[PDB]
Amino acid sequence: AWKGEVLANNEAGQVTSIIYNPGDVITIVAAGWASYGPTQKWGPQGDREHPDQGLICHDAFCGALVMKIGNSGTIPVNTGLFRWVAPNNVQGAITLIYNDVPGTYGNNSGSFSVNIGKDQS
Amino acid sequence: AWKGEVLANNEAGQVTSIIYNPGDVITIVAAGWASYGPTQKWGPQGDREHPDQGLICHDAFCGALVMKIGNSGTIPVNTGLFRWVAPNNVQGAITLIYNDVPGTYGNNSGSFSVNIGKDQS
Amino acid sequence: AWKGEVLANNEAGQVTSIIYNPGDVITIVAAGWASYGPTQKWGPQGDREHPDQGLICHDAFCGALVMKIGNSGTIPVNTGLFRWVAPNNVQGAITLIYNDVPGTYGNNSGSFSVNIGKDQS
Amino acid sequence: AWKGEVLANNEAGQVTSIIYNPGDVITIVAAGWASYGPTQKWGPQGDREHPDQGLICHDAFCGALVMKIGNSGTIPVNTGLFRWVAPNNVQGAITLIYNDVPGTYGNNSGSFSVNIGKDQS
Numbered sequence: 001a002w003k004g005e006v007l008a009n010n011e012a013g014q015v016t017s018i019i020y021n022p023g024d025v026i027t028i029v030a031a032g033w034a035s036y037g038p039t040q041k042w043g044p045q046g047d048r049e050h051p052d053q054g055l056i057c058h059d060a061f062c063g064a065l066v067m068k069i070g071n072s073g074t075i076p077v078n079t080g081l082f083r084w085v086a087p088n089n090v091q092g093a094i095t096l097i098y099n100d101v102p103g104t105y106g107n108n109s110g111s112f113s114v115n116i117g118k119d120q121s
Numbered sequence: 122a123w124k125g126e127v128l129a130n131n132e133a134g135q136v137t138s139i140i141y142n143p144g145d146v147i148t149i150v151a152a153g154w155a156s157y158g159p160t161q162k163w164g165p166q167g168d169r170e171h172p173d174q175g176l177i178c179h180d181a182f183c184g185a186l187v188m189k190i191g192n193s194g195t196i197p198v199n200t201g202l203f204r205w206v207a208p209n210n211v212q213g214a215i216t217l218i219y220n221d222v223p224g225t226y227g228n229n230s231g232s233f234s235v236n237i238g239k240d241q242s
Numbered sequence: 243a244w245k246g247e248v249l250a251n252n253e254a255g256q257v258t259s260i261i262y263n264p265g266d267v268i269t270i271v272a273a274g275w276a277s278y279g280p281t282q283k284w285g286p287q288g289d290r291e292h293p294d295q296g297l298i299c300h301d302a303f304c305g306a307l308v309m310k311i312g313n314s315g316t317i318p319v320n321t322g323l324f325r326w327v328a329p330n331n332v333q334g335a336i337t338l339i340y341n342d343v344p345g346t347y348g349n350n351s352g353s354f355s356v357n358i359g360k361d362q363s
Numbered sequence: 364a365w366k367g368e369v370l371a372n373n374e375a376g377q378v379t380s381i382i383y384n385p386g387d388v389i390t391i392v393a394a395g396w397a398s399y400g401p402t403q404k405w406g407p408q409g410d411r412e413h414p415d416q417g418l419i420c421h422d423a424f425c426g427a428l429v430m431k432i433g434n435s436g437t438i439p440v441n442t443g444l445f446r447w448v449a450p451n452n453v454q455g456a457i458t459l460i461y462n463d464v465p466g467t468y469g470n471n472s473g474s475f476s477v478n479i480g481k482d483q484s
């Protein structure tokens with residue numbers, strides 16, 4: 001299992017120690033408070049009131065936690081995934097990222113604390 | 122495992138099918154949007170800026186998801202619990218509740234969706 | 243999880259720390275060599291050639307590993323059980339026992355090494 | 364998970380669907396009766412009284428269940444492995460084999476039933 005922090009101002013994202021292999025079932029739980037700019041802070045689902053101005057993930061709100069598995073596209077994580085299997089045969093290392101517009105991560109603050117484990121299969 | 126919804130307006134909370142027994146390890150993932158009165162909505166960690174005016178759980182913000190195991194006191198859940206083990210002596214059915222001040226749930230709205238399962242131990 | 247030894251000459255059985263509760267899924271793996279009397283030894287399935295002369299469990303051979311769950315009758319374990327659910331209405335502490343005729347354990351030797359865990363549910 | 368049978372007279376062994384990846388935790392439970400030649404049968408720990416005359420796995424008795432993981436040497440399985448992690452730099456598909464001397468499998472009989480699953484990690 002992996003336990004770590006994902007900083008909201010890190011545009012490259014946080015590489016974890018988890019490799020997602022074919023057939024793996026995983027569980028993620030995320031908590032904490034971060035902002036894409038404003039003084040207010042939001043949790044791992046982000047800000048449902050902010051429009052999408054070119055987010056790295058169009059299926060999650062600005063300020064949400066998202067991930068990539070290997071060379072996949074971005075996949076929403078939000079507060080977590082329960083006993084989840086990756087669709088479409090994706091595989092590889094798990095990278096966690098804060099959902100913002102590329103080039104605008106410099107004014108971001110806060111972080112999420114994230115647990116990832118593999119389930120029985 | 123159990124999956125279900127917990128309404129923000131329900132002072133009685135939502136009884137699940139999960140009975141927590143001594144030594145159990147559990148994982149909970151919660152998601153969704155609710156409000157304790159305002160037009161804005163918050164996720165399962167609640168509103169970090171709002172004062173405690175007599176919440177059912179003083180260890181979580183107003184608007185957070187909390188639980189009871191049997192006749193325990195309230196326990197914060199927030200966005201979830203990863204491979205968690207209860208304090209000594211706690212046992213019984215898990216009831217999920219929205220954290221507000223008793224008598225004031227009448228202006229609350231929305232709901233959280235919650236998954237619970239038992240882990241290997 | 244519990245790991246320990248079950249001595250072949252212990253007629254009372256070895257009480258483990260595992261309490262089997264309704265809904266639990268368990269895995270057991272047993273190993274080792276034991277005898278009910280002869281100089282030869284057998285593994286946890288026991289001796290398929292020996293007759294049942296009053297065994298504490300009639301559904302397993304003499305010299306097999308069996309168990310009781312609380313006050314239940316005996317249940318065969320043999321080499322182990324994979325992600326197993328107990329009959330309804332049995333619960334309580336798991337006791338592990340070598341299968342011999344009562345009164346006749348004094349000439350037994352050897353032991354089984356046994357591991358028990360609870361699985362995801 | 365994988366469930367199947369390992370035949371005592373199959374010298375090549377049985378390639379399963381389980382790929383052991385770095386960091387995996389696995390559980391194997393084996394049961395049944397087989398022989399390496401004699402009329403008598405033994406369980407998955409084989410025959411502790413039989414000399415090693417060139418076994419594929421010198422770390423297990425003749426008639427035991429063993430495995431290979433990818434490019435590994437043979438590894439004893441016996442009655443099973445509980446929540447087991449492989450040595451460093453062992454990975455690949457799990458092949459299960461009956462322990463006998465090469466060229467002497469033709470007179471073997473019986474089989475073991477085997478369950479393999481991945482555990483939480």
Ligand SMILES: OC[C@H]1O[C@H](O)[C@H](O)[C@@H](O)[C@H]1O
Binds near residue numbers: 051052062100104105
């Ligand atoms: O839409 C995203 C965008 O939102 C605000 O304008 C922030 O100030 C920017 O840094 C950027 O995060």
Ligand SMILES: OC[C@H]1O[C@H](O)[C@H](O)[C@@H](O)[C@H]1O
Binds near residue numbers: 225
């Ligand atoms: O502090 C709790 C309190 O918050 C606001 O005042 C709401 O209008 C009330 O219904 C109550 O929820």
Ligand SMILES: OC[C@H]1O[C@H](O)[C@H](O)[C@@H](O)[C@H]1O
Binds near residue numbers: 292293295342343
């Ligand atoms: O069948 C049970 C019986 O088998 C042999 O006779 C042993 O010597 C006895 O002690 C008893 O274990």
Ligand SMILES: OC[C@H]1O[C@H](O)[C@H](O)[C@@H](O)[C@H]1O
Binds near residue numbers: 400401414463470
């Ligand atoms: O030691 C191995 C050897 O044991 C006996 O001799 C069997 O007859 C042979 O087929 C071979 O299995």
Ligand SMILES: [Ca+2]
Binds near residue numbers: 036101105
């Ligand atoms: Ca920004």
Ligand SMILES: [Ca+2]
Binds near residue numbers: 157221226228229
């Ligand atoms: Ca209210």
Ligand SMILES: [Ca+2]
Binds near residue numbers: 342346349350
């Ligand atoms: Ca005896």
Ligand SMILES: [Ca+2]
Binds near residue numbers: 399463467470
């Ligand atoms: Ca042979």
